[PDB]
A paper describes a structure:
Glyceraldehyde-3-phosphate dehydrogenase (GAPDH) is a highly conserved enzyme involved in the ubiquitous process of glycolysis and presents a loop (residues 208–215 of Escherichia coli GAPDH) in two alternative conformations (I and II). In the presence of inorganic phosphate (Pi), GAPDH catalyzes the conversion of D-glyceraldehyde-3-phosphate (G3P) to 1,3-diphosphoglycerate (BPG), accompanying the reduction of NAD+ to NADH. All the structures reported in this paper have four subunits: O, P, Q, and R. Each subunit contained two domains: the C-terminal catalytic domain and the N-terminal NAD+-binding domain. Two anion recognition sites, “Ps” and “Pi”, bind the C3 phosphate of G3P and inorganic phosphate, respectively.
The apparent KM value of the wild-type EcGAPDH1 enzyme for D-G3P was estimated to be 0.73 mM, the Vmax was 0.272 mM/min, and the Kcat was 224,926 min−1. The KM value of EcGAPDH1 was similar to that of Cryptosporidium parvum GAPDH (CpGAPDH). However, the Vmax was 171 times higher than that of CpGAPDH. This means that EcGAPDH1 may have a higher enzymatic activity than CpGAPDH. Amino acids Arg11, Ile12, Asp34, Arg78, Ser120, and Asn315, which form hydrogen bonds with NAD+, are highly conserved in WT and the mutant binary complex structure of EcGAPDH1. The overall structure analysis showed that the catalytic domain is an open pocket with positive charges.
Residue numbers in the entry:
A (entry chain R), B (entry chain O), C (entry chain Q), D (entry chain P): 1 to 333
The structure:
Amino acid sequence: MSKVGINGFGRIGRLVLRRLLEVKSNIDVVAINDLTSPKILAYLLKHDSNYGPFPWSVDFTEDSLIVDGKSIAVYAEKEAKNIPWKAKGAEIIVECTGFYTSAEKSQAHLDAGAKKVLISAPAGEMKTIVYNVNDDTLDGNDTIVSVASCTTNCLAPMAKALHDSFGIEVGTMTTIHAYTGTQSLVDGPRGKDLRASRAAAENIIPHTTGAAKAIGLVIPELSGKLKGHAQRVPVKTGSVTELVSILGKKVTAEEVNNALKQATTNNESFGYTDEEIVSSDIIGSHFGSVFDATQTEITAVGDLQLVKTVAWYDNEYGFVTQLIRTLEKFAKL
Amino acid sequence: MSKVGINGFGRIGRLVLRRLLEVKSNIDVVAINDLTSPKILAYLLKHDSNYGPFPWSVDFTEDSLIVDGKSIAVYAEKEAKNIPWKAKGAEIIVECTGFYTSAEKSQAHLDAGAKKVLISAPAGEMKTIVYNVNDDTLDGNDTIVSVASCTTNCLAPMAKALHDSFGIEVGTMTTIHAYTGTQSLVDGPRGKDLRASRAAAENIIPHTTGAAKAIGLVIPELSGKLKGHAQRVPVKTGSVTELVSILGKKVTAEEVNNALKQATTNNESFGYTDEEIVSSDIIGSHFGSVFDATQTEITAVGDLQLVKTVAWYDNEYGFVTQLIRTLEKFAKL
Amino acid sequence: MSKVGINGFGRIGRLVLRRLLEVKSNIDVVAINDLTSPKILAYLLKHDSNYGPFPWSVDFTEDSLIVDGKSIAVYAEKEAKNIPWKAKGAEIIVECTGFYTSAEKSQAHLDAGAKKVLISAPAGEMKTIVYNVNDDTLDGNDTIVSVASCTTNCLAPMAKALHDSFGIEVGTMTTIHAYTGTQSLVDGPRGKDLRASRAAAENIIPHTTGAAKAIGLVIPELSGKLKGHAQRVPVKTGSVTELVSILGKKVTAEEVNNALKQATTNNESFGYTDEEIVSSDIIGSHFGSVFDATQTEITAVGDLQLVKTVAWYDNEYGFVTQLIRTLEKFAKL
Amino acid sequence: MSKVGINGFGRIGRLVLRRLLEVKSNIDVVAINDLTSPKILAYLLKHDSNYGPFPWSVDFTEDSLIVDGKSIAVYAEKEAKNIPWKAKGAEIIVECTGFYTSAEKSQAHLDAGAKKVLISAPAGEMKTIVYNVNDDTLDGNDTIVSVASCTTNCLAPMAKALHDSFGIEVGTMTTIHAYTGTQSLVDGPRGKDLRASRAAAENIIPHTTGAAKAIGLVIPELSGKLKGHAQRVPVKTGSVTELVSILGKKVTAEEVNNALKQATTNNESFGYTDEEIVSSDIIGSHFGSVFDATQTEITAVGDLQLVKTVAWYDNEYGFVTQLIRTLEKFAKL
Ligand SMILES: NC(=O)c1ccc[n+]([C@@H]2O[C@H](COP(=O)([O-])OP(=O)(O)OC[C@H]3O[C@@H](n4cnc5c(N)ncnc54)[C@H](O)[C@@H]3O)[C@@H](O)[C@H]2O)c1
Ligand SMILES: NC(=O)c1ccc[n+]([C@@H]2O[C@H](COP(=O)([O-])OP(=O)(O)OC[C@H]3O[C@@H](n4cnc5c(N)ncnc54)[C@H](O)[C@@H]3O)[C@@H](O)[C@H]2O)c1
Ligand SMILES: NC(=O)c1ccc[n+]([C@@H]2O[C@H](COP(=O)([O-])OP(=O)(O)OC[C@H]3O[C@@H](n4cnc5c(N)ncnc54)[C@H](O)[C@@H]3O)[C@@H](O)[C@H]2O)c1
Ligand SMILES: NC(=O)c1ccc[n+]([C@@H]2O[C@H](COP(=O)([O-])OP(=O)(O)OC[C@H]3O[C@@H](n4cnc5c(N)ncnc54)[C@H](O)[C@@H]3O)[C@@H](O)[C@H]2O)c1
Ligand SMILES: [Cl-]
Ligand SMILES: [Cl-]
Ligand SMILES: [Cl-]
Ligand SMILES: [Cl-]
Ligand SMILES: [Cl-]
Ligand SMILES: [Cl-]
Ligand SMILES: [Cl-]
């Protein structure tokens, strides 16, 4: 299967395409569905506030985009059941709308004539892959899979290294996270969630995330052992996850950092830094997660020890590189 | 005619209530319509990212707000014609949703039992008032009235003063304007305006406005003599309007500033400053416009002269002060 | 009664005046030292990007400010020993410059003729007060004293309550903190701290703070039990401190929240909220810290329990209210 | 000579070196002077909040940078007359500190052993070059020259084009400009410029600029015929210049646009767009100026006409491409 449709040509959807082209995948994006015109999708693909001009030619007709000379159909169907995926034979749907995050809802793509769906968000109790952590759980028989959230892709590889080297007995995470499209520009209603109603670029905004809760799906041994949340803050992309853990062994910072260094060596999904970087330095990252040895902290009082480990992530592009790695493997099974 | 309803309890609508309590108007707001729950409306009213905590007590029930101890009904009817304005006797509707910006649209509130409608926005060729420029044109027969935009309330008093003192033969305006809820948080579709699709807190974004174009509604002798546009920029509120004019007389800067100063004297709508202020100093202003003498500029070669005059405005609260002066006059006709 | 001098009329030092006038304190501020002219200090006092217009009249002469009709002498001596504090009889110095944060350095004010110094920052091993936590350790003999940081003033009352109710065995803190004047507007050298060189309004920036490390000066039984750091983010003021603890007893969330609530009752320094607030809601707070029951989290596995507690603080005005409470007491001893 | 030194390794100084490497220049940067250590300079060069990772290797020793394998000497001499430019034979100094913006001040570099200085800012009455507008006025005997400001490089080619096609009789300019390091992060003294004291990322801040006033240095026929100013706003780089002119002929929008379009054809310095861009789309531009046809406006009343023309500019990288074009020519004369 080398035929993809993108449902939801948003921040993640457009970057899926940009990254497919960047790595010369033999995947062919043949169709896109959204809620707008080809003219507007083309404007948006061409001009990006976070990543700058598209590196390839972009043009449009009344029913398509022309991206680096290839035609991609554009549809505007509110309900996935009505999307004509059969029309151009879209086999694998990259589900990036946020509105189909369960096997029940993403079934509508299959009903509509697609074979597989890769959901770009947590999608409940289904297979949930962080590339280079648990992508060997994938088989030929899988039809609807999740690559979880940006935060899950940041946390999982750090948690996994810690769990493998030291054991994690219990832990809590806080991500200091760039604001996203689910939040508000000015204070006003945003469904039921009171905090999401507040002006995102003018506030620190606590926010729920399931990355830690649902880590069970990626790292089965940590199931139920982690909790966490986010503080959404006014940067446009680039985020950082802090994990505070009780480990199964007494450790030093040096030891922790060496264990992480090993886990990131020749690891295309998981990077390492001992440089004094800030969030803008992670924009454009090709990793799902970048461990930052400069922020490691061990608080010890006798036999008790809290270990804080910190990893950066580009919640847009960095996450997308993990989505594509997983897509490329999903496509070959 | 002292009982009011607010349709659209947004940036403008919530501030309408705040300003009304602040000046202890004899006007009572007896009902609110929006699209959400009293809980959410009360949360937004209590906590404001731009003006801080509401200065009175705020609580709610399943169908009401309780503000400063007074009960205000809350309805959630998306079509104005369905709002049960008669239940609490709402007579004047302050229309702040953005969705009824015409006589044809806003007459739905009359169908729904109200007596008059004041529209918080330009609304085509109906009676349109900038308080202390043309509120003397209001009469007993006016049933649907507009107060034009924030930008109109800024531009008009400056243009009026220039018109009366010197003549404006032609002019062009640029307002450098705070972002608003019609813009986008992250890059993505925002109706059909391509620029409006771009991340508002991360861009200078050219934006069309009608303030100059429709100035004839407020200053009839300047009908068709002005054009202009906006540059939307990343401040939360607070804006500034520049007008470049060919006047009907040769002038000096001191002479323009003195004329403006005279027009702002005992003028509750139109302030003056010669202080080196910046936009956050205008937040919370009780004027619709504050002329800034430090920015006046006369550019002349022989008989060819360009005059640049600049005024600040808090496009949320300052505009709201104008809306409320207009409302209090409208209610006593 | 007591005559005060302010050294460093910056963000903090200006708000010290504002808050003293706001509470109608008996303290008279008779002198200010900074590095600039009365005209510039008057401009800055009058117009504040975070708190708006000064609530009292502000004027200047060539050597003073006139504030609400009262004269305050202005000096510009970069070395504190050259400040003529005796000329106006300034007895208590509020040291707000950043450059005299030790007993040895602040001694220069005593040499220059002041009697006491209160330093608006950590200042090594001196008496270090968080009002309503340990202000009872002050006595008539103290002549140089610290009120620690904003973060300490947020952290200490929350750590005190947890300590008093449950014991803290070990803990780690992260504060997501507004940017301040120690940081950089654009990427450029900023002393020796590499991360402080980076554009503050455009980045999440890891940053060291001694709040947790030196907490033993305020709560001696927690000496050595806490560590932490900051992430500096693009909000202009308003900050939040998370603390992850192992406590000496097993607990529920409700139980933690009730203990904190009791601790905040009739506590003018330490507030409580169960509302879904965001950082701009803390701006202008009259508390040093506001505990947020909505963010409390207990992660538990077997007999292991991590407890996350979170408190907001207005690192500018809120801290200042603490500084003023301490100042009022220190001046009467 | 082809050996260059940079004085002021700031936003402009560092981008000078990046651009020199990017276009594979002949020029050999042999020395840098600033105020700090090689370590700090290396960190700043390597990590850039606006343009991302340096595309070449960066290391340092105690007295040098090593960039793409080449050693560059670092000095820390706050007075230019003391910079030891003869040690590595720097012949042309790119003066980017902002402290030597006159002939008399930059003479210090010649006293210090250099032959020529190119000042990255206006510097009074000396040859002032906007590349592809008046670079042919440079000759073999010029030793101190200016490239003016970012704004000048944006305005001049638009003005030149309008002047050549229609005549400019008189005109006034407003640039909506990214904040820069001359401004303040938080409200605090900034020399004598009151508006520069105010928090740059939280305000619209009127600011003077000589772009229009000194335009006669670049286009002598326009001397005295233009004036203008800036509004500094909260975007990190990327700016826009609006010019309102009385022209020598009556025109249509299409006529202005086609004339501009012709002046931009095969012009490496002056670009054209008819796309609906916003400021972030100009970041990384290799033009000094990009004329934007979508914003052209003609306001006409009988006999009279005002013509608004607008061009974007990356006040950092864009301007730097102009500086480098000029430097390459200067070095070969
Ligand atoms: N932004 C991030 O940092 C991030 C990171 C990882 C995962 N995700 C997830 O990826 C998904 C997309 O997030 P995003 O930031 O790209 O959101 P977005 O809001 O930028 O994009 C959503 C796109 O889907 C379209 N859309 C909405 N409803 C639709 C429908 N019914 N049919 C077709 N198109 C529809 C919108 O028009 C838009 O173009 C979400 O599930 C999100 O949780 C986002
Ligand atoms: N924000 C400004 O600077 C400004 C200044 C002057 C005028 N205005 C105008 O005032 C009006 C409101 O602007 P705002 O900035 O407060 O917008 P907003 O988006 O903050 O508020 C609109 C409110 O109306 C509600 N709403 C939307 N459709 C509705 C419907 N059918 N029925 C009931 N409620 C509905 C929304 O839920 C929201 O609470 C617009 O016409 C706008 O142009 C805005
Ligand atoms: N969030 C906060 O801003 C915050 C919170 C708590 C404590 N503090 C502490 O308060 C102090 C001041 O912080 P700020 O944010 O007000 O800084 P600031 O930079 O806004 O103000 C410092 C003032 O000191 C002046 N100054 C510098 N050197 C001087 C000298 N040698 N003599 C006299 N004046 C001098 C400056 O001109 C400026 O007006 C620091 O110790 C800081 O850590 C700050
Ligand atoms: N930033 C822009 O948008 C822009 C555009 C065009 C021109 N310019 C001009 O270029 C010049 C530099 O601007 P910038 O934005 O790079 O400034 P900046 O503040 O980023 O850089 C100035 C550099 O000079 C160093 N410095 C200061 N005084 C010094 C001295 N006496 N000796 C040696 N080094 C010293 C600083 O440490 C810093 O690294 C200014 O003249 C400015 O007007 C700036
Ligand atoms: Cl469906
Ligand atoms: Cl959780
Ligand atoms: Cl209706
Ligand atoms: Cl117009
Ligand atoms: Cl506008
Ligand atoms: Cl620590
Ligand atoms: Cl000028």
